[PDB]
Each structure stands twice: as C-alpha cells, then as structure tokens.
C-alpha cells in the first residue's frame, strides 16, 4: 500500500527526527506487518542511530529467543546490561551471566549483590563414629562456587570477610582457602582443615 512511502519521504526530509520513525512503526503495528518485516524496520531505526543504545532498548522491548540473542549482542557491544541482570541470572551458566555484568561494572555493578546470593544461596546448596575411624584406618594402611566466592570476596567489606571465608569452605575451596589465609577460631580451623586434607603435613 501507498501509505508507507509517505513516511519514507518524511525520513528523507529529516532522518534524525525519532518521532517520525516511531509513528512509522506505530502504523506498521496497527496494520500488523509481519515480525520479519518489522524487524527490518527496527534494524533501520537502529542503524540510522547506531551511536545510541536507547533505540536498541525500544527494539528489544518489541523483540520481547531473538531478544536474548540480540541482548547478547548488545552486551558484547551498560545500563541496558544492568537491565539484563534478571534475565542473565536465570541462565545459571555463571560465566555467561557474570562476564557481562562485570564488564558493565568495568564501564560503570548493580549485579554485585544478586550474584553474591547466586554463590552462597543458589549454587552452594547443590554444589556442596566408627565409620570415621574405619575410613581413617583405610587411609592409614594405604570449583565454580569457589570462583564465585573469590569474586564476591574481592570487593567485600571487612564485616563480610568471615561470611566469604565460610562460603569458600562450603565450596570445597581447600587450595583457595589455604592460599588466602596465608596472607575468629572457625576461619583458622578451616585453614587447618584445608592444610590437613591437602596433605601439607609439615605445615599442618
């Protein structure tokens, strides 16, 4: 139909007038052009404005799997990555959720508390008498959670240091705890246990 061209000439008049593109999109919604057509128009709407992310965020608000794919692109290309933190957390593959968030903190960070619960609360529960004497005698006669805990402890304050250390212990981070402690009784005894299990008898 003819009516699109009336917006196209208007785009040729003044292409950086965002309200023109918005009204053009609105008409294509009201008539109901296909998803693959409206994608081409939204990508034009972005490409004429490739220096600013806000129009990408409107596009994502319409593309809402392709919205996750383009969101991975927009995270590769930081407030929108902060807006992505709830979606990214649900992926559970910790490198993919955490790397974009730490990049956004590098180019700032608001994920620093949700991901901490992703260590002690989310990851840790799943990643964690005469029998003991028998096991000891048998011995005598013969780490994503850890990384998450280390990341949390990298910028943790002094009050949460003990909690971070405890989380490291629950992550079976014997080597990490042994290294960090080399720099409360429970923390000292946890470092003891890391040394004892790692087989560092002379230091133990």
């Amino acid at each position: 139909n003819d009516e699109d061209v009336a917006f196209e000439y208007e785009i040729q008049k003044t292409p950086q007038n965002i309200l023109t593109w918005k009204r053009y999109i609105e008409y294509w919604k009201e008539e109901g052009r296909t998803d693959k057509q409206i994608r081409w128009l939204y990508e034009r709407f972005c490409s004429q404005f490739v220096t600013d992310t806000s129009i990408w965020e409107d596009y994502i608000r319409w593309e809402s799997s392709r919205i996750f794919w383009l969101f991975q692109r927009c995270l590769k290309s930081d407030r929108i990555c902060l807006s992505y933190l709830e979606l990214a957390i649900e992926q559970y593959d910790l490198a993919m959720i955490r790397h974009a968030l730490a990049s956004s903190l590098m180019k700032m960070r608001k994920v620093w508390d949700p991901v901490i619960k992703f260590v002690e609360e989310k990851v840790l529960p799943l990643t964690q008498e005469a029998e003991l004497i028998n096991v000891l005698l048998v011995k005598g006669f013969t780490i994503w959670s850890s990384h998450i805990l280390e990341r949390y402890l990298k910028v943790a304050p002094q009050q949460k240091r003990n909690e971070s250390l405890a989380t490291l212990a629950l992550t079976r981070d014997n080597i990490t705890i042994k290294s960090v402690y080399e720099k409360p009784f429970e923390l000292n005894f946890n470092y003891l246990a890391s040394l004892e299990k790692l087989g560092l008898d002379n230091q133990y």
């Binding site: 061209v5 196209e8 040729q12 034009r44 004429q48 593959d93 730490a102 990049s103 990851v123 990384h147």
Partner: peptide, 28 residues
C-alpha cells in the same frame, strides 16, 4: 572481565538506515 578463565571452574560452571529504502523511494 569477571576474572580469568580456569578449567576446573569452567567445567563446574558449564555443568550447572535511511539509505536502506531512500533510493527506492526516489524511483518507485
């Protein structure tokens, strides 16, 4: 980056324009 890659941690973490139509509108 969110730290640096290491294999023991990686394995556990993984096992968890206007010109697009402007000229056409100049002849159509």
């Amino acid at each position: 980056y969110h730290g640096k890659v290491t294999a023991a941690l990686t394995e556990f973490e993984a096992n968890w324009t206007l010109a697009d139509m402007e000229h056409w509108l100049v002849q159509r």
